[PDB]
Amino acid sequence: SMTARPLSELVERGWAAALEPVADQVAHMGQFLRAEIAAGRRYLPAGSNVLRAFTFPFDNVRVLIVGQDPYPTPGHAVGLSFSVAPDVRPWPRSLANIFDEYTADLGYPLPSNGDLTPWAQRGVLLLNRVLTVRPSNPASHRGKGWEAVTECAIRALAARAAPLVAILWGRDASTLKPMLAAGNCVAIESPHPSPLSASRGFFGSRPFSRANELLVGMGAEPIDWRLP
Ligand code: NA
């Protein structure tokens, strides 16, 4: 529980230090979620998954992907932006659109399922700008305190003595751009992959190949994007 336990317990060691400036804020978000339940409102993902993106090592991140907020439909969000459990079908529409761009860009077959944990295990941070949502109500937790947390995460990544490539999908993700100003960081921005915006420039954006080009141009290893 993020109200009750500290970052050293909740997240990976490097992330716990990176998020020190927002330690009180994370506890406050735990208190917000408690109050939602007390009032009879729900949230997604499950409490134990809210900080999941920060359970993969901070020092290993080479690319971050940033979306808006978790999937609104119960049974979809798992704490890793855009990912679903390997037994979910049909895929969420945003994810189907991501995978159509993945095939168009990379030439790979469609993935077997919607589980993006291989990316997380290969140095991709799968972050949402806001880390909870009320069911059925996209953006319902915008402005409730998560933005300071995810801002802190990006600044800390950007401060490391390492290259970083950010892929910012949609308007709320784009508000992290200022924090990526330093010369070791590069940002790719496009419209969000949901059907409401994907046809404004997400399709054809080739983010995966571009990210790898950028990493190689900074002396870093490219991501193996191939999903099984
Ligand atoms: Na999500």
In angstroms, the CA 29 to CA 46 distance is 14
In angstroms, the CA 104 to CA 99 distance is 8
**What letter would DSSP give residue 108?**
P
Q: Which two tokens stand for residue 112?
A: 């077997």
Ligand 1 centroid from CA 37, angstroms: 20
Which of 65, 42, 58, 11 is closest to 192 using CA atoms?
Answer: 65
Handedness of CA 27, 162, 114, 97 (dihedral sign): positive
Asked if 126 contacts 83 with a C-beta cutoff of 8 angstroms, the reply is yes
Ligand 1 centroid from CA 22, angstroms: 22
Residue 6 CA: distances (Å) to CA of 116, 128, 226: 27, 21, 35
Q: Helix count (H) and strand count (E) of the chain? A: 8, 4
Ligand 1 centroid from CA 79, angstroms: 6
Ligand 1 centroid from CA 80, angstroms: 6
Ligand 1 centroid from CA 176, angstroms: 18
Ligand 1 centroid from CA 82, angstroms: 4
Task: Give me the amino acid identity at 77.
Answer: A
Task: Give me the amino acid identity at 58.
Answer: F
Say which experimental method was used. Answer: X-ray
Phi/psi for 115 (5° steps) reads -85, 115
Ligand 1 centroid from CA 98, angstroms: 13
Residue 169 CA: distances (Å) to CA of 144, 149, 177: 20, 18, 11
> CATH 3.30.360.10: does it fit domain 1-228?
no
Handedness of CA 190, 157, 124, 6 (dihedral sign): negative
Q: What is the resolution of this structure in A?
A: 1.0
Residue appearing with tokens 């999941």: 52
Bridge pairing between strands 63-67 and 185-190: unpaired
Asked if 62 contacts 164 with a C-beta cutoff of 8 angstroms, the reply is yes
- At what angle are helices 146-159 and 23-39 packed, to 10 degrees? 150
In angstroms, the CA 190 to CA 194 distance is 12
Close Cβ partners of 29 (under 8 Å, ≥ 6 residues apart)? 2, 131, 132, 144, 145, 146, 149
Q: Which two tokens stand for residue 71?
A: 């999937």
Asked if 153 contacts 176 with a C-beta cutoff of 8 angstroms, the reply is no
In angstroms, the CA 97 to CA 5 distance is 37
Active-site residue numbers?
A: 69
Phi/psi for 30 (5° steps) reads -60, -40
Ligand 1 centroid from CA 180, angstroms: 22
Asked if 220 contacts 60 with a C-beta cutoff of 8 angstroms, the reply is no
Residue appearing with tokens 């002396």: 219
